[PDB]
């Protein structure tokens, strides 16, 4: 009336646990997952003997050590959140609208449709964390369940609740690196302190939160210096394979008649102080493709509050 299971965190290093048919998994061991299903509140029996189960709580040091090697410097709550978010998202589906892949509306997941479709245009990024890169490679192959749940868990997103696409998009990118060169040089100066050049490289030179157009990124900025005066800062060199600018929702009239410079952008519908709706947009063949969570429609002109704006490559040098 006893069974032996193998608990694992990485699917490679296992550790056995003897369990009885009297108490449930949660009281004897902790929360466990079997073939993607939570069985923590079920009583063990013969159909579990010999099989491996993914432990989520109550990890030991050596399973915690392996956890940090697979997911990075994560918090004890992380593994439970990830495993639970993955099973809750099982019902969600990616639907092909106009030759691309988009995420259907379910449980307020439209902010995620904006994040994933914007990432899908960045075709030169990889993730340094192994689990994340594995999920990301699976998403690009068809099954996006892992990748969706992971960015949800890394972004501290609660299930079925609306969130901020620019927050999540830039948080996720902070875990990524670029497969090519990229360079961004800031010139800071202060009439009392002096002149100094700050250099950023790689993927960090392709994202910025605070401006939504390339003119505003290249504008001279002024803020308080450590001396008390006003320090100045201005971009003097920029070479990237693409540029992602994000800001608060800003009303604009985007039109294809003037042939805009950006290739894609995200839109917030509603007012900023309430629950709104996200729509992803790309420009292809002289039109705007609007992607509202599993559906697509085209327009020539659109008055809309944009948030994230994705530009092509940057070859810039001034002063």
């Amino acid at each position: 009336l006893t069974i032996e299971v193998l608990v694992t965190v990485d699917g490679v290093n296992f550790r056995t646990v003897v369990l009885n048919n009297k108490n449930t998994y949660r009281s004897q061991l902790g929360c466990v997952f079997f073939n993607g299903a939570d069985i923590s509140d079920t009583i063990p029996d013969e159909k579990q003997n010999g099989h491996s189960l993914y432990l989520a709580d109550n990890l030991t040091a050596d399973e915690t050590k392996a956890l940090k090697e697979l997911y990075g410097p994560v918090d004890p709550t992380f593994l439970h959140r990830f495993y639970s978010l993955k099973a809750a998202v099982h019902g969600w589906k990616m639907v092909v609208c106009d030759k691309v892949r988009s995420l259907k509306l379910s449980d307020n997941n439209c902010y995620l449709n904006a994040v994933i479709m914007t990432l899908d245009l960045l075709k030169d990024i990889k993730f340094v964390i192994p689990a994340l890169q594995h999920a990301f490679m699976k998403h690009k192959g068809g099954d996006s369940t892992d990748f969706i749940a992971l960015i949800m868990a890394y972004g501290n997103c609660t299930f079925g609740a609306p969130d901020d696409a620019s927050r999540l998009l830039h948080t996720v990118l902070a875990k990524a690196e670029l497969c090519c060169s990229a360079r961004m040089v800031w010139r800071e100066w202060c009439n009392v302190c002096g002149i100094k050049d700050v250099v950023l490289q790689g993927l960090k030179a392709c994202c910025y939160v605070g401006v939504q157009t390339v003119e505003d990124l290249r504008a001279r900025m002024t803020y308080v210096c450590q001396c008390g005066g006003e320090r100045h800062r201005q971009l003097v060199e920029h070479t990237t394979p693409w540029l992602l600018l994000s800001g608060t929702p800003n009303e604009k009239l985007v039109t294809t008649s003037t042939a805009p410079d950006f290739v894609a952008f995200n839109v917030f519908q509603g007012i900023e102080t309430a629950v709104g709706h996200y729509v992803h947009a790309r420009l292809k063949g002289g039109l705007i493709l609007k992607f509202d969570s599993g559906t697509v429609s085209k327009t020539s002109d659109w008055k809309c509050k944009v948030t994230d704006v994705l530009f092509p490559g940057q070859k810039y040098s001034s002063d």
């Binding site: 439209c110 969130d163 308080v224 509603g270």
Partner: protein
């Protein structure tokens, strides 16, 4: 050992915060949530265009005295 940095709100007002580079940004976020009347789930912080992740220490971001961190409203779409 602690130093003074600035967090700026949507309205443009900077406030001083005594912090340590070994503190987490989750700790700074609770100081910011205390000075203004906003809760942590309603905003996120940026420095030099990049977001600050909750579980990381401030020293990971290169903050010097009177560095200006920005408060960004966490949208709900």
């Amino acid at each position: 050992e602690p130093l003074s940095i600035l967090v700026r709100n949507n309205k443009g007002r900077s406030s001083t915060y005594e912090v340590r580079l070994t503190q987490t940004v989750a700790h700074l976020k609770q100081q910011v949530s205390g000075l203004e009347g906003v809760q942590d789930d309603l905003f996120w912080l940026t420095f030099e265009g990049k977001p600050l992740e909750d579980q990381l220490p401030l020293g990971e971001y290169g903050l010097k005295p009177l560095s200006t961190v920005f408060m960004n409203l966490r949208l709900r779409g």
